[PDB]
Design an enzyme around this catalytic site. Structure first.
Site, PDB file in Angstrom:
ATOM      1  N   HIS A  64      41.902  40.289  39.849  1.00  0.00           N
ATOM      2  CA  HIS A  64      41.387  41.586  39.044  1.00  0.00           C
ATOM      3  C   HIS A  64      41.833  41.622  37.507  1.00  0.00           C
ATOM      4  O   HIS A  64      41.069  42.217  36.851  1.00  0.00           O
ATOM      5  CB  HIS A  64      41.768  42.709  39.763  1.00  0.00           C
ATOM      6  N   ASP A 206      44.683  37.791  45.786  1.00  0.00           N
ATOM      7  CA  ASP A 206      44.731  38.354  44.266  1.00  0.00           C
ATOM      8  C   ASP A 206      45.259  37.277  43.151  1.00  0.00           C
ATOM      9  O   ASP A 206      46.142  37.678  42.573  1.00  0.00           O
ATOM     10  CB  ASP A 206      45.080  39.956  44.070  1.00  0.00           C
ATOM     11  N   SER A 632      50.335  43.956  37.239  1.00  0.00           N
ATOM     12  CA  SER A 632      49.468  43.181  37.824  1.00  0.00           C
ATOM     13  C   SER A 632      49.575  41.657  37.070  1.00  0.00           C
ATOM     14  O   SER A 632      49.594  41.777  35.994  1.00  0.00           O
ATOM     15  CB  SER A 632      48.022  43.713  37.425  1.00  0.00           C
TER      16      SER A 632
END
Ligand SMILES: O=C(COc1ccc(F)cc1)N1CCCC1
Ligand SMILES: O=C(COc1ccc(F)cc1)N1CCCC1
Ligand SMILES: O=C(COc1ccc(F)cc1)N1CCCC1
Ligand SMILES: [Cl-]
Ligand SMILES: [Cl-]
Ligand SMILES: [Cl-]
EC number: 3.4.14.-
Lengths: 697, 695
Positions: A64, A206, A632
């Protein structure tokens, strides 16, 4: 509580980290005067974290995080977003426009310097102590005359911490040639899609892979065909030892924002204004949207992204309000401020109690205005699409009132109309959303506080919201394509001035700006009082068990690989497996499709050295580390500093953790590095990436 | 794993003792004496209950005593919402049409039945499974005056193992069973339909009754002179609670299982029964829910119809999950292949021939069975105007004597029941348009009910127009249309009524399919008698239990949770804290009783909370239960009552075909929570005092 520590705080925390399982030497993790593991951490594209994993500048981050780059290089012939991307040679790695990676070269405490410069106070209420412009002037003064010219690729920045009680200067090295190296298909990179956002257990792979490029000497250089991969100072070794329950884990990254020093009155305001309004308004908006999407498959295609985008902060606000209601966040802020006030009374210094009083009084005073602001922002600015319909500019109106500049004004107004009423815009769906949103808004906001045009609901339409909305579209130039074209053929400024849609849009934006301008003065007394408040907390309980709020700077956090009990009789363990991906497979649900190559790896148990001791294939794990947005892609380390995973999310039960860390509920959701290496190997077949990494048994 | 006959206790006792059973075999079940089996009852024909005192007090589920609680509820004394607590025996409420059945004696009559059957002659006779035939044998064996010589007693013979074993039951039936106590519906049905088939569960699913009898303890219908029954055995209540891995056992009346299905019957159950019910109910429920959410008056009218449709819908979803993930088809195939290989070695081909007959019958009835489930799910239960009035022969032979008024009054009564306070013609038209569009896509023109042919022939494929026309022209389309008909009734108007023709046509097709499918059941039943005989001769009457058939069975296991999915564990016990976590004041299903909320806040748990001070609510166990086991007593290793079975998790509904050790659990209300509610919510101390409570 269990925090986001400055690199400077490593020394005072080291003994506790060692007692919790840390085995590496302090200066191998962070050394202010030499190469350390901190040198392998990057701020990836301004809002994510990344890590260098090879001597040739290979970088891992989330899928992402690298999503826009994967999408920008995707075409109908080579859909990298859908099938993944695996450059089989370095020359095949794709350049990315507007990308950056930031290394934190040096960090220095400049508190005494900044505080001495600040003493030249021409106003004790000045906000220069938090001004990026002012702090940059101090950073330039300290770095020297033309620092950026004498040291290309380097830049200096000063930031305030602890509400203006501590200042750090960061020397940053920025690289702008960062190429796409590898990515799994979206079916792995975003397996849960929006259904599993903020969810633990999680089964999402991810990750994405990039490579930093630089000139012949390893110095930053913009994209050039002559650029060579960067040989970095330091890179992470990849561990294949995996994780066990209770194992020590640590993260370095760039958490964006927290509110650890909120007063109890700020927690109440956050709940009763910010969160309740966002929850109530988004539930109305989403409810109408979902009913229309379920009844018309074409509406589902047009509104899926708008629906998903509205749901993300809606879910966050639900998770935050659950913590306020069940974890005593308000009570713990109240206890924190009462303890400081009692200590200040004993020391003969009333300024801390006066500071908390100023914050409470400011919160209580701005309550009605803040309620009106959130109501219009959630209800209309975000809630109703025709609020962002075209408003003719001052120069556009001037042009329409004797030159060829009239056709220029019509072409500009048309371009904005075409962007508003695009392939995804339904006027029927928008009218239904507006009728429900305005009915709620009109129930909450009294006549005297309404945007001027909304007064027509009572005055002209006898309270009929449906009729008022129908009239806006029936009579507006932006109500349909045929209505716009009729206007464009014979445009008059007087038609635009009386247009019901233009008047609504102008009126709601005027009220939104007026409320913003009236509310802005209330921020400064709270900021100044917080400087005194946090100074007291630090002097009383020390710069030890209370971390500075996150501010997009490099921090470390440590904890353990541990699950939790979300509710009575339910336990979520610390680790998910590939089995869980297969349990969730739904071929006719795009969110839960399973990559055929991955399904075959599972069936054949082709796990190689990546499986756990029991032969199970790990996917993700969770930890008691304290993370937030900005973390992230963060590297997750072993007790030895070896990479064991990448942080990619946090469970909804822990979103209240930005105000108060929740030891029994809050978890960082991390993709296991064994699963990352499995996907590179058995799905991408990109052996050259495995070979350039230093993999430890 | 199984639902064992009482006769199989001797054969299972050693394994039960190794699993933790401490009580003596004959104290649990004694074929010629009093045992714990004597405290178990079949409550109101479809539930289980248990005697818990020397004065005939009976515990069962709240959902088992629901109809009685509702029948005694008024606007002034709403016992359903407020609970009921008779403060004296004279205050306990009688119930019309109630019964409790004790299983007095049980005997194996296999040789007797098999000898009587030898006189049949027709080898394909179904008398071996006929209740009428078996009752004639039961009467012949008991005597030509048994119930008169033994008052309250009756006999019954049932087939087991597909007709390979027969048992005669001597039953004692009591019909004066009075309501004593019940928690409010907020406790008794806490989860309401949201938590149906769900573990973790926080529902205090219990109600209290009392068996009354004549002065000698003999069955007697309701009489003001009736006295409470002093039973020969009642359960002691344990307050020691449960721990993970504790031995647990249940006695009850499981209704039906399909443990001997062939692989072809599992495929048929999935691809016809379950897929059609799932597909059709999802369409029906989808339209219904949209209408209920848009109009609060539609939500009031359709809430019960929606909930009733959802129950078997959820069951079918749980069953299809087991077929897909637990290898049910594969395990039946392995079972039948093993029997076929053994029959080949022994030189007896009849077992392979029996499995072949079952497969061939399943394959042959496939299209008809698909058509039956499609009309039943799609129209018979899917569309309300399918059950609209159809004029009888007596009614048509009245409209063409002054009995024209009586015919209209009967047709009117049925119209008023169809178009009642809960019926919306608009909602029904929307449901019918979606249900018929799916039905017309699945059922070809040549197989359609005759009236449905008009969609293509008269309405150019427009289902909406066909449905609009049914209501616009029918005498049952609205009240004004019925009244106009009732003022000037002609049989010609009724014989051409689009709604009457639709209703008649769909019921004709439903009956025709039922009649065509009925002959296929018998060859499968006969082949199952041979099939199960082979399985029993090969692997023995030991690890394979007879299918449930509403008779008394025992099951044993342990108090144990399970992992429903990757990285998720559900423990073995829920607490009062879980009730409080679920509280939602503006959701009628999750409202918490204020008296109970106060007990939790004050920790007024008394002797009922566990060692850590937490109040238990429910627990789960690896016992093998099914529908019919609601209200079953759950026993300790010592036979003391530790809870009442009230549900099973959805993951284990496939357990009726193949027991699922890692997923299937009985959901049980903890007896400590039952006593806490009687005590702190009902304040009914006299009930606690009459029970024998062990520390
Ligand atoms: O412990 C501290 C300061 O702590 C930090 C200083 C710099 C830094 F980057 C991080 C922490 N103090 C105790 C006496 C007053 C100052
Ligand atoms: O279960 C929930 C909400 O569940 C989610 C919230 C956010 C999210 F991203 C996903 C799930 N709640 C029960 C207590 C009040 C909130
Ligand atoms: O989660 C479910 C179904 O969940 C329920 C089914 C029935 C019920 F009463 C309650 C829940 N499934 C996931 C795999 C396919 C089925
Ligand atoms: Cl002071
Ligand atoms: Cl916590
Ligand atoms: Cl008895």
């Amino acid at each position: 509580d269990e925090g986001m520590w400055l690199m400077q705080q490593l020394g005072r925390k080291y003994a506790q980290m060692k007692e919790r399982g840390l085995k590496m030497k302090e200066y191998d993790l962070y050394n202010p005067n030499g190469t350390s593991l901190k040198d392998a951490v990057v701020l990836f594209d301004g809002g994510c974290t990344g890590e260098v994993v090879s001597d040739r500048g290979l970088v891992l981050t989330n899928h992402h995080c690298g999503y826009d780059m994967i999408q920008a290089h995707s075409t109908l012939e080579h859909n990298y977003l859908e099938n993944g991307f695996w450059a089989m040679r370095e020359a095949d790695e794709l350049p990315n426009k507007d990308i950056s990676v930031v290394f934190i070269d040096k960090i220095e405490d400049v508190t005494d310097y900044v505080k001495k410069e600040l003493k030249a106070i021409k106003d004790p209420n000045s906000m220069d102590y938090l001004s990026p412009k002012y702090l940059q002037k101090l950073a330039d003064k300290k770095a020297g005359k033309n620092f950026s010219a004498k040291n290309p690729g380097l830049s200096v920045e000063i930031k305030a911490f602890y509400g203006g009680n501590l200042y750090l200067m960061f020397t940053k090295k920025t690289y702008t040639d960062v190429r796409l190296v590898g990515a799994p298909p979206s079916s792995i990179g975003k397996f849960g899609a929006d259904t599993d956002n903020w969810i633990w257990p999680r089964h999402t792979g991810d990750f994405s892979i990039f490579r930093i490029y630089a000139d012949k000497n390893g110095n930053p250089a913009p994209y050039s065909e002559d650029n060579v991969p960067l040989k970095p100072k330091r890179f992470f070794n990849i561990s294949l030892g995996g994780v066990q329950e209770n194992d020590y884990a640590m993260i370095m990254g760039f958490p964006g924002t927290t509110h650890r020093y909120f007063t109890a009155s700020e927690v109440d305001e956050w709940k009763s204004i910010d969160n309740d309004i966002r929850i109530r308004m988004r539930d109305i908006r989403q409810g109408v949207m979902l009913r229309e999407m379920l009844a018309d498959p074409q509406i589902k295609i047009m509104y899926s992204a708008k629906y998903a985008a509205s749901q993300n902060a809606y879910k966050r606000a639900i998770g935050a309000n659950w913590a306020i209601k069940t974890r005593g966040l308000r009570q713990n802020k109240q206890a924190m401020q009462d303890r400081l006030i009692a200590w200040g009374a004993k020391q003969g210094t009333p300024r801390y109690e006066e500071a908390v009083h100023e914050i409470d009084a400011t919160v209580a005073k701005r309550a009605d205005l803040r309620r009106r602001y959130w109501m219009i922002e959630e209800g209309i600015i975000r809630g109703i699409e025709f609020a962002r319909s075209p408003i003719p500019t001052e120069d556009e109106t001037k042009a329409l009132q004797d030159a060829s500049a009239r056709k220029e004004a019509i072409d500009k107004i048309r371009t904005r109309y075409s962007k508003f009423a695009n392939k995804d815009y339904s006027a029927e769906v928008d009218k239904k959303v507006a009728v429900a949103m305005l009915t709620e808004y009109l129930k909450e906001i009294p006549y005297e506080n309404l945007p001027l045009h909304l007064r027509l609901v009572k005055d002209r339409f006898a309270g009929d919201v449906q009729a008022y909305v129908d009239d806006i579209f029936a009579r507006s130039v932006f109500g349909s394509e045929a209505q716009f074209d009729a206007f464009a053929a014979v445009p008059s400024v007087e038609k635009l001035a009386e247009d019901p849609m233009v008047l609504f849009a102008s009126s709601v934006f005027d009220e939104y700006r007026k409320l913003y301008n009236e509310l802005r003065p209330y921020d400064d007394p709270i900021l100044r009082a917080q400087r005194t408040y946090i100074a007291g907390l630090l002097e009383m309980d020390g710069d030890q068990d209370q971390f500075p709020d996150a501010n997009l700077t490099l921090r470390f956090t440590y904890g353990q690989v541990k699950g939790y009990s979300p509710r009575d009789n339910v336990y979520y363990g610390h680790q998910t497996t590939l089995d869980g991906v297969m349990e969730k497979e739904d071929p006719d649900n795009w969110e839960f499709v399973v990559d055929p190559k991955l399904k075959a790896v599972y069936e054949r148990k082709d796990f190689g050295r990546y499986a756990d001791r029991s032969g199970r294939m790990p996917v993700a794990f969770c930890a008691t580390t304290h993370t937030t947005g900005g973390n992230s892609g963060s590297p997750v380390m072993n007790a030895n500093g070896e990479l064991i995973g990448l942080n990619f999310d946090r469970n909804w039960e822990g979103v209240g953790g930005d105000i108060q860390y929740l030891a029994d509920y809050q978890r960082s959701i991390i993709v296991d590095i064994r699963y990352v290496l499995l996907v590179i190997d058995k799905v991408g077949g990109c052996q050259r990436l495995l070979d350039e990494m230093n993999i430890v048994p």
